[PDB]
Design a binder for this molecule. Structure first.
Ligand SMILES: *[C@@H]1O[C@H](CO[C@@H]2O[C@@H](C)[C@@H](O)[C@@H](O)[C@@H]2O)[C@@H](O)[C@H](O[C@@H]2O[C@@H](C)[C@@H](O)[C@@H](O)[C@@H]2O)[C@H]1NC(C)=O
Ligand SMILES: *[C@@H]1O[C@H](CO)[C@@H](O)[C@H](O)[C@H]1NC(C)=O
Lengths: 178, 200
């Protein structure tokens, strides 16, 4: 029993579009719209399969034209914001001075527009951080993961700060060694 | 192989408008039984759907009613959709099967005491199971050959987003000397169960 999902979206007025394949909840690849490029979630995947990113660029164009038809047909009914719920966890049990990874899991939100910042002791961090694209859910909200490799210690505390139009205030989820 | 996409068919406080195509391929017993769905979502609301088990397009809301009727009248569009289980689902299955259906990553299992709150003596044994794939897993606690079934809390299956999973299963217990606790893990990456013992 397995499920493969081709999930796309186009968002107005932001003019944002994404295209990705999902296998049992994990991302196989997405298409970098700017770079016209297929980006495999694990590098090894590209050594076993291929995808023409041009086709995804063409699908996004059709998605845009379909969106504008349906926007007019709905008399410009807008989407209801649904704010995310945010969880910060580690890749594995945390041991001091042993490298680990902080995961910021942003879940159950729409539209797929979010601002995410890692904070160490209140200061924004951008070194080594990575992120996924907007992943699908069965209830058609979105998921997203942000990652921050870190060296655990008693001195550093961490926050994942998440901004979304459905939120009144920035959502900060704390992490510290216990 | 080359993954083929499904092309589909044609129909700050300022408002947003969102279009979400979803092309689903559901596989049962490999590609023995396959189900294809072509789903179109406007602002999180499904408008029109093709379900291969139905054989024709159906409007989920009134917003999709024109396109379901028009697409159902087109012989060529309809036969493209009814063929998708073969031209699309079964094709992509053969392309990705070796590194998706067959992917197996072994869990790392560790046991350590913990505390529910600031207390003096540990009142939790934690079985940490991390880094495994796929997500199907069973974690059981044993106390000297007797399976402890009461007093357990689990995080549930945690998806790390990087093709690995994680789970923690806490056993509520103040360990007594001479007690041997066993965490047992069953996962398709190993042929036998995994066991990790902890002693007070
Ligand atoms: C979009 O508005 C269409 C007309 O504008 C309004 O007309 C009525 C409802 C009134 O409120 C007036 O002040 C507005 O200008 C309206 O016709 C359309 O309804 C849809 O199309 C009609 C022809 C019917 O099929 C009806 O069942 C539909 O809902 C409005 N669209 C929607 C999606 O509601
Ligand atoms: C993200 O930050 C930019 C810059 O201020 C802002 O324009 C945008 O609205 C923000 N998005 C949110 C808060 O969802």
């Amino acid at each position: 029993e397995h499920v493969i999902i081709q999930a796309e979206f186009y968002l107005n007025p932001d003019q944002s579009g994404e295209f990705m394949f999902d296998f049992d909840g994990d991302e196989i690849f997405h298409v970098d719209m700017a770079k016209k490029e297929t980006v495999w979630r694990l590098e090894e995947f590209g050594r076993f399969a291929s995808f023409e990113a041009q086709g995804a660029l063409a699908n996004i164009a059709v998605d845009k034209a379909n969106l504008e038809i349906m926007t007019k047909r709905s008399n410009y009914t807008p989407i209801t914001n649904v704010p995310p719920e945010v969880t910060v966890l580690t890749n594995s049990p945390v041991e001091l001075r042993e490298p680990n990874v902080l995961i910021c899991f942003i879940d159950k939100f729409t539209p797929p527009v979010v601002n995410v910042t890692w904070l160490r002791n209140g200061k924004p961090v951008t070194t080594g951080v990575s992120e996924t694209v907007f992943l699908p859910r069965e209830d058609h909200l979105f998921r997203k993961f942000h990652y921050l490799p870190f060296l655990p210690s008693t001195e550093d505390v961490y926050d994942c700060r998440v901004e979304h139009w459905g939120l009144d205030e920035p959502l900060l989820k704390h992490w510290e060694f216990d | 192989g080359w993954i083929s996409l499904w092309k589909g068919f044609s129909f700050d406080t300022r408002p947003r408008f969102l279009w979400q195509p979803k092309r689903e391929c559901h596989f049962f017993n490999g590609t023995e039984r396959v189900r294809f769905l072509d789903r179109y979502f406007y602002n999180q609301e499904e408008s029109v759907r093709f379900d291969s088990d139905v054989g024709e397009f159906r409007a989920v809301t009134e917003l999709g009613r024109p396109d379901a009727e028009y697409w159902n009248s087109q012989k060529d569009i309809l036969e493209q959709a009814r063929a998708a289980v073969d031209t699309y689902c079964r094709h992509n299955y053969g392309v990705v099967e070796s590194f998706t259906v067959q992917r197996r990553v072994q869990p790392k299992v560790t046991v350590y005491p913990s505390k529910t709150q600031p207390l003096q003596h540990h009142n939790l044994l934690v079985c940490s199971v991390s880094g495994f794939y796929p997500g199907s897993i069973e974690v059981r606690w044993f106390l000297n050959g007797q399976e402890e079934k009461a007093g357990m809390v689990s995080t549930g299956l945690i998806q790390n987003g990087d093709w690995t999973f994680q789970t923690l299963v806490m056993l509520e217990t103040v360990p007594r000397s001479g007690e041997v606790y066993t965490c047992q893990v069953e996962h398709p990456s190993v042929t036998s169960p995994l066991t990790v013992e902890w002693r007070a």
